[PDB]
């Protein structure tokens, strides 16, 4: 049982911080290795250069080829696979162009069918995928 005395504030705060280190979110936030392993470097978005297009197979009960691209981030050079969302949207991307990439949703976790993909593309050649898909703007090269 818990110590409950009047002069036990040191034991209580010491025990709380040691046992705080056993939480998954607390350790991911405060130990410093998750921020050094994060490709985005703790940023909401990052810009990169497309290296390859790649077709990634959906996890077992779904059967599809999810269209992704392999990008290399500008600021650190780390390599990323990023999903291109809507249908036909892969045809807007060519090789070696700037791509703005955001998170997919689950803060570093794979989302849905796509295995190992944490990222989705947001912009190509500084026009959004949404305006390109709905035909609101055109991309230069």
């Amino acid at each position: 049982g818990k110590c409950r005395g009047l002069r036990t504030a040191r034991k209580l705060r010491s025990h709380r911080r040691d046992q705080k280190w056993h939480d998954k979110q607390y350790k991911k936030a405060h130990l410093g290795t998750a921020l050094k392993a994060n490709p985005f470097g703790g940023a909401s978005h990052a810009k990169g250069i497309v290296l390859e297009k790649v077709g990634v197979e959906a996890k077992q009960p779904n059967s599809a080829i999810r269209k992704c691209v392999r990008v290399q981030l500008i600021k650190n050079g780390k390599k990323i696979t990023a999903f291109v969302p809507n249908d036909g949207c892969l045809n807007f991307i060519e090789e070696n162009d700037e791509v703005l990439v955001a998170g997919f949703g689950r803060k570093g976790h794979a989302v849905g069918d796509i295995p190992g993909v944490r990222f989705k593309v947001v912009k190509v050649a500084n026009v959004s995928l949404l305006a390109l898909y709905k035909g609101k703007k055109e991309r230069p090269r």
Binding site: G5, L6, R7, T8, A9, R10, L12, R13
Partner: protein
């Protein structure tokens, strides 16, 4: 009582932590000057000091009176 005409006293207090509403025992050491008119001062007896100008690197208080230990005759 190991330095030359200067002693080391400690002061004990309780520091309050609001989140647990409790205390922790904390202490601070102090080198103070002991004049030779307080002879046969022993370890563990209570001493009353008063603030004066810095006399050393670490000495800023001067012993004003000494009361013996709670049991010492």
């Amino acid at each position: 009582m190991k330095m030359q005409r200067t002693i080391v006293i400690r002061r004990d207090y309780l520091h309050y932590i609001r989140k647990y509403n409790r205390f922790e025992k904390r202490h601070k050491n102090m080198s103070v000057h002991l004049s030779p008119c307080f002879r046969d001062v022993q370890i563990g007896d209570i001493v009353t000091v008063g603030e004066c100008r810095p006399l050393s690197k670490t000495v800023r208080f001067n012993v004003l009176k000494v009361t013996k230990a709670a049991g010492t005759k």
